[PDB]
Structure formats: structure tokens, C-alpha cells
Ligand SMILES: [Zn+2]
């Protein structure tokens with residue numbers, strides 16, 4: 268579930284975690300500054 | 316009286332933007348190279364860096 | 378015979394005046410009357426409430442459909458219009474308010490002015506070339522208007538000048554009739570030249586008490602062809618009638634559906650056998666509300682309450698009717714009042730057809 | 735910038751008799767001007783220039799608003 272749709276829970280079947288949340292958690296645990304966090308989460312940008 | 320042109324006219328504003336010599340330039344940015352583009356903007360109305368004369372620019376337009 | 382004794386008089390240019398004669402003859406080579414002239418029509422009404430006459434006047438002013446000339450988006454050609462002073466807003470404001478008497482919505486005009494001279498050249502309305510639609514056998518606007526002026530070496534190119542339909546209330550360019558007279562012929566008047574009476578209106582009865590039913594209304598139409606004046610004015614009058622009837626018929630479709638829950642009609646059963654009806658209609662004016670109040674009041678002399686509150690910032694008319702009958706009887710009386718309005722304006726239609734030959 | 739097409743108040747078609755009313759008026763002024771420089775006309779203190787009959791001959795009614803806007807409207811061509 269790299270992009271464009273939700274991660275789904277195999278145990279139940281409903282939505283589990285959006286990928287940008289995973290990337291945000293990785294960056295927060297990876298000493299990422301706000302600018303280095305704002306620019307990396309740009310492939311998840313909303314409606315153009 | 317309002318619709319017929321009573322006290323009706325045109326109101327003007329100006330936009331004067333300057334450059335830094337050989338650093339900056341006038342042109343349409345591209346999403347895949349340029350950084351921190353303004354959220355909710357509209358870059359498609361630019362033609363060679365400037366919006367063409369005669370078009371209607373609204374809030375959020377570059 | 379509600380509507381009798383109508384008289385029609387055009388507004389014509391007096392060519393006995395040497396100054397006007399010379400100016401017209403050297404400007405437009407004009408020696409006789411213009412194709413379209415204003416027409417003043419004075420009408421006498423008898424046995425009809427002033428609410429109906431004033432509603433007819435209001436409809437003829439700014440509630441009747443009417444045609445103007447408008448510029449489609451992109452019609453003003455920036456690539457060719459080199460004039461720095463004739464902006465799009467100014468020119469389109471000039472064009473919108475030219476009084477026209479059109480036959481169809483298909484005509485499309487164009488304005489192509491080139492200034493090859495060394496002096497400012499005035500763009501008149503005779504420079505509007507019809508480019509689409511059937512060829513005109515009679516002009517739809519006067520050729521003596523001043524659309525604009527071009528500085529030397531400038532140009533003005535405008536395409537897609539079409540005919541747009543609308544009501545005068547939304548935009549003033551659709552206004553049709555301009556008021557010239559309104560009086561009550563069944564109320565005596567003081568001589569207001571005297572200093573004792575110049576601070577009063579003149580009528581010998583206060584508006585808080587008077588109920589006139591014999592009126593004179595005079596309206597002026599801005600553009601009517603010379604050889605068909607009686608054909609045009611009559612049409613206008615008839616048009617107004619239908620419009621009012623149509624609007625009234627809309628309310629007639631509300632009362633018919635009082636059993637089902639309808640948003641525009643609310644019925645309450647109050648104390649002491651009293652019933653209440655609230656009719657909220659959007660985008661209605663004082664015409665329909667005043668007509669409804671007047672005719673309900675005439676139908677029910679002992680009504681508890683009636684009001685037609687039209688709110689400016691709510692864009693709606695709320696008619697409140699409180700009466701000591703049941704819901705069914707109240708609806709029956711309302712339908713009777715609506716039928717009275719319909720028959721009154723049908724009689725107006727018939728009298729308009731009968732009078733103007 | 736010109737005399738309006740319709741009266742600002744009521745909407746009578748003033749514009750269709752505007753241009754003529756301009757030019758004719760000039761000759762009338764030339765009749766009544768009298769040994770005086772043009773730019774000093776509004777300071778002559780002896781002029782009686784009345785345009786009632788001219789507007790009446792144009793067919794325009796005796797409405798206050800219509801004649802007011804016909805007479806008083808400035809023309810951009812005459813100042814620029
Ligand atoms: Zn789960």
C-alpha cells in the first residue's frame with residue numbers, strides 16, 4: 268500500500284493506517300526537522 | 316441609478332515586483348522541481364511568467 | 378368596462394426650430410422622424426382597486442420581460458481595440474442601456490470602428506452592423522446614439538453583440554416603462570398654489586381613510602416604431618396582464634396542495650376557533666403581496682389580520698392571514714380571492730384589446 | 735465621459751437626442767455670447783442663456799431629472 272489508498276487490516280477488514288502517517292512517524296522518530304518533514308510529505312499533497 | 320452608471324467607475328491597483336540580479340527569474344514553476352509552492356495556489360494562468368492581459372484573476376491565483 | 382378612455386401620443390422632434398433642424402441635418406442628415414420614438418400612454422381605470430393599478434404599473438416598469446443588447450464574454454477584442462479610453466466597462470454600459478424593440482433573440486451585431494483621421498471620431502449607434510440573424514426590414518434601435526469616441530489612430534472592435542432577456546428588477550437595463558402620471562379621479566383636491574395648502578399633498582381625504590377606485594395612470598415607453606405604435610403599446614399592456622396572472626397562478630398551486638406538507642404554506646389552529654395561514658414565497662415583490670392582501674381583505678371584511686410583509690434583506694414575501702374560520706373555509710376564501718384577481722386581470726386584457734384599435 | 739444614453743434617474747432615452755442637443759446648443763450660445771471670450775462665459779454676469787425651448791423642440795418631456803442630466807453632463811472630448 269505505497270500510495271493512493273488506505274492500508275487495510277487483515278485481521279478485521281477496515282482501514283488501518285494511511286501511508287503518510289507511516290512516513291510521518293518514521294520522520295518524527297528519525298530526527299526530521301519541520302522543513303525536511305514538510306518537503307518530504309509533498310508526494311501526499313492534496314487536491315492540486 | 317446604480318446600474319445606469321451613477322457614481323460608477325474603475326479602480327486601479329499596481330503590482331511592482333523586483334528581481335535579484337542573476338539569482339531570480341520570471342517564469343512558471345514546475346511542481347516536481349520547485350519547493351514549498353503556496354498551498355491552494357493557481358499557477359496555470361501564468362504565460363511566460365506573467366498572467367496575460369485581459370484575464371480575470373481571483374483570490375489564490377499566482 | 379374597467380379600463381376605458383386611453384390616449385396615446387408619441388414624442389417627436391420639432392423641426393420648426395432652426396437650431397435643431399440644422400444640427401440634425403448636418404450631423405445625421407436627418408430631416409424626418411426617427412424610426413423609434415418614445416410614446417406616452419395615459420389610461421383611465423374605473424371600478425378597480427389602486428392595488429391592481431399600481432401592480433400593473435410596477436410590472437410594466439420593472440417586472441415584465443424585456444430585451445437589451447449585451448456583449449458575450451470575449452466579444453471585446455483586446456487584440457484589435459487599441460483605444461485607451463473606451464474601456465470594456467464603459468462601452469458595454471453604453472450598449473446595455475440603448476432602448477431596443479427586438480423581434481427575436483437570434484440577432485447578433487458587431488461594432489468595427491477604425492480611425493484613419495487625425496481628429497477624434499465619434500462612434501454612433503448607426504455603426505452597429507448586423508452580422509448574424511435574419512436581415513432586418515426595420516431598425517430595432519435609433520441610429521443617433523453616441524456609443525463612444527476614438528482618439529486619432531485608434532480602433533474599437535467588438536463582436537458577439539447579442540440580445541439578452543431579463544426583468545427590470547434584476548438589472549435596470551431591462552426597465553420598460555417610465556412613470557409620467559398617477560392620480561385618483563374620485564378624490565377632490567385642494568388648490569395647492571395657496572400658501573395655506575402647499576404643505577399638504579392636495580387630496581381632500583387622508584390616505585389613512587381614502588379608498589379610491591377611479592385612477593389615471595400615464596406611462597412612457599422609450600422605443601416604439603412609428604407605423605405600429607398602437608400594435609406595440611397594446612401588446613405591452615397585454616403582456617403585463619399575463620405576467621401578473623402567471624405569478625398569481627403560482628400561489629394558486631400552493632393553496633391547492635394544503636393537505637400535503639408544503640414548505641411555502643403553513644397552517645396553524647389557534648385558540649377561539651381561530652386559524653392562521655402563513656405563505657412565504659421567495660423572490661416576490663410588493664405587487665403580488667399587495668394584490669393578495671387587498672383582495673383577501675375585500676373578500677373577508679371581518680378578517681382578524683392580513684399582512685404581506687416583503688423583507689429587503691430576506692428577498693421574500695410573507696403573507697400572514699388570521700381568520701376565525703376553519704382551515705378548509707379559509708382555503709376556499711383564499712381561492713375565491715385568487716379567482717377574483719384572475720378575472721379582474723382577464724377583464725383588463727379584454728378592455729385593452731377592445732380600446733386600442 | 736459623454737451624455738448618458740438614458741437618464742440616470744428614470745431611464746428616458748436621453749442619449750438618442752444627446753448629440754444633436756450638443757451641437758445645436760453651441761450655435762445658440764454663439765447667438766447670445768457677445769463680445770466675450772469663450773472661457774469667460776460663466777462669468778459674464780449679463781447672460782440669459784435659456785435652453786428650455788431647445789430641449790422642448792427635441793421632444794424631450796419637461797422632466798426635471800432628464801433635462802438636468804442632458805444639460806449638466808460634461809463631455810470628455812471637450813476637455814481632452
Ligand atoms: Zn483490524
Ligand SMILES: [Zn+2]
Nearest residue numbers: 741744799800
Ligand atoms: Zn429622467
